[PDB]
């Protein structure tokens, strides 16, 4: 549903407007023709006008492949890939990748096949691509219409930006709306934290710990931010919409309570790279409960609610009891220095809720004081039943043990420590973290589950920063703004809006 004229607020402007964009723009590489989706599709788009270039797309695609393909049909896929890209007489052979780089590669399918067998390859030619072709790209149209799409994304975002329809949603320091872009008809759902009552708590400094943990993450399993914008009386996320229902309802109101462990095998792993995601930014989320995993319209989850994450600086602890009780790790109930360590016994946690139907140490017909809750979680070994395989019994002690440094997954190592446990012995975390392993639940789409200081307007503009780079690219892209609106000149030519002698 995108409004009458989107056309007009998304229209290009002229090339010359986009002079302060070109110089002050980090000409990186990694970001300009990969991380910014909109970046990769134009320098991909680039490659197509050249014949030379043209190839190194198309082998970099079949290596994506090739990472997800099945093991039963890997070495298949494998010299698909070799007699059309590593044959010295293909029309569509890769060069760069030296002789001495392919032969290795011949012996590798000499031997068993493994999912990162064309890895060296494929550096070897984003090696090539870095050199003369992105530098030719900065040259050329389609860089030009790159900083066009950056001027769009810079403009402001206000209230107009956006179309609220309904309260869906509810929680401390404000409540959660549907939202909807007018110009691109996305749908959203807004955090709306009332102004006056931040001030009051003085809770400033967690809104802003919050934004900015969300803008810096960009995980298939974590709710993303995609606007943060001021208005008056309130300040606004603008946060991935999630229809699905929460995990605390599947497991008790859809569940026997619980799911099967290969059901619950799904959510975990999802979840256990949304960790994976967060902690690459040093960055603990402490308030692991079912309740706060999420779903989607086809049956994904994600994290959501991150006002108690807080970032870790490198090589240091924090300190601080906070979250719920029975879902706090020992460390945090005795108020330590603890690291990512909590997340993890959060993991445990969801894991043995999800397949046994209650808590760990809280039965579901159970009527026991905060007090004894916590002194289970402290000295109390939890005890399991026919419902977990050895595999799952395993995983859930090593990331339920009380002592955060033997804990699974609190190494050096990190998530990679999980991922190779058993319990994920039948889980390709590739093709998961792809999206092509189908969900055990797909939800319905019917489907309904649930003053004047001035030391004020210094917090805002550091929280009102606009829309968010990545996400604000992939909304062009899914609602089809960028398919549409990205055009040029009939004839591989220059159209008008990139032309510099008649504006
Ligand atoms: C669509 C929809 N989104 C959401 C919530 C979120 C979402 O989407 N992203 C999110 C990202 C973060 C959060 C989040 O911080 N939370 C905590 C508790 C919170 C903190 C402060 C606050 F002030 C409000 C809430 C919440 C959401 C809800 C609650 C619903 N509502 C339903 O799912 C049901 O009505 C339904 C629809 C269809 C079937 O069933």
């Not at 020992?330 to 220095?337: A, G, I, M, S, Y």
């Not at 969801?350 to 046994?356: A, D, F, G, K, P």
């Not at 139907?357 to 070994?381: A, H, N, W």
Request: aromatic share 10%; with cysteine.
């Amino acid at each position: 549903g995108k409004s009458k004229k989107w056309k007009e607020i998304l229209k290009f402007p002229h090339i010359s407007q986009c002079e302060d964009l070109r110089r002050t723009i980090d000409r990186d590489y990694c970001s300009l023709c990969d991380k910014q989706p909109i970046g990769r599709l134009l320098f991909r788009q680039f490659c197509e006008t050249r014949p030379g270039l043209e190839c190194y797309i198309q082998f970099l695609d079949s290596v994506a492949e090739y990472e997800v393909t099945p093991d039963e049909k890997l070495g298949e896929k494998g010299k698909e890939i070799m007699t059309k890209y590593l044959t010295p007489k293909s029309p569509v052979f890769i060069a760069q990748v030296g002789q001495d780089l392919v032969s290795q590669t011949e012996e590798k399918l000499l031997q068993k096949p493994c999912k990162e067998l064309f890895s060296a390859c494929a550096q070897s030619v984003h090696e090539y691509l870095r050199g003369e072709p992105f530098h030719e790209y900065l040259d050329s149209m389609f860089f030009d219409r790159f900083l066009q799409w950056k001027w769009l994304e810079r403009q402001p975002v206000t209230k107009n930006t956006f179309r609220q329809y309904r309260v869906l949603g509810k929680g401390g320091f404000g409540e959660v709306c549907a939202c909807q872009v007018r110009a691109t008809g996305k749908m959203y759902a807004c955090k709306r934290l009332e102004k006056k009552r931040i001030k009051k708590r003085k809770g400033e400094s967690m809104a802003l710990n919050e934004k900015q943990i969300l803008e810096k993450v960009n995980s298939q399993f974590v709710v993303n931010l995609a606007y943060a914008y001021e208005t008056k009386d309130a300040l606004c996320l603008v946060l991935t919409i999630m229809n699905g229902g929460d995990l605390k309802f599947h497991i008790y109101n859809m569940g026997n309570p619980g799911f099967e462990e290969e059901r619950a095998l799904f959510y975990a792993a999802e979840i256990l790279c949304g960790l994976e995601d967060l902690h690459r930014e040093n960055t603990v989320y402490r308030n692991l409960k079912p309740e706060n995993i999420l779903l989607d319209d086809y049956g994904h989850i994600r994290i959501s609610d991150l006002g108690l994450a807080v970032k870790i600086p490198e090589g240091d602890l924090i300190r601080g009891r906070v979250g719920t009780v029975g879902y706090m790790a020992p460390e945090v109930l005795n108020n330590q220095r603890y690291g990512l360590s909590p997340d993890y016994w959060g993991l445990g946690c969801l894991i043995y809720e999800m397949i046994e139907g209650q808590s760990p140490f809280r039965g579901r017909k159970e009527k026991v004081k905060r007090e004894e809750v916590d002194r289970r979680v402290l000295e109390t070994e939890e005890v399991y039943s026919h419902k977990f395989s050895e595999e799952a019994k395993s995983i859930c002690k090593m990331l339920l043990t009380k002592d955060a440094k033997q804990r699974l997954g609190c190494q050096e190592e990190g998530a990679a420590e999980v991922k190779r446990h058993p319990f994920f012995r039948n889980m390709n975390f590739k093709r998961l973290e792809a999206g092509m392993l189908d969900p055990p639940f797909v939800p319905d789409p019917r489907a309904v589950y649930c003053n004047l200081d001035h030391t004020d307007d210094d917090f805002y503009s550091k929280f009102s920063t606009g829309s968010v780079s990545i996400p604000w690219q992939n909304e062009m892209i899914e609602t089809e703004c960028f398919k549409e609106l990205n055009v040029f000149g009939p004839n591989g030519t220059l159209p008008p809006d990139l032309n510099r002698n008649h504006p």
